[PDB]
Design a protein around this ligand. Structure first.
Ligand SMILES: [Fe+3]
Length: 51
């Protein structure tokens, strides 16, 4: 799945993960740590929408 950061337009792509921030590819948004935030704008998970 892909999730958009409603603040900045960043797309969290579960296939890509966010490795620079400790998230390996294929990590589901729901599996992201609670304290993970948008690597661009710092928005909390609550501000993401599943596409
Ligand atoms: Fe963002």
């Amino acid at each position: 799945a892909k999730w958009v950061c409603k603040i900045c337009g960043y797309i969290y792509d579960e296939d890509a993960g966010d490795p620079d921030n400790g998230i390996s590819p294929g990590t589901k948004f729901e599996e992201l740590p609670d304290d993970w935030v948008c690597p661009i704008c710092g928005a909390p998970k609550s501000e993401f929408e599943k596409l």
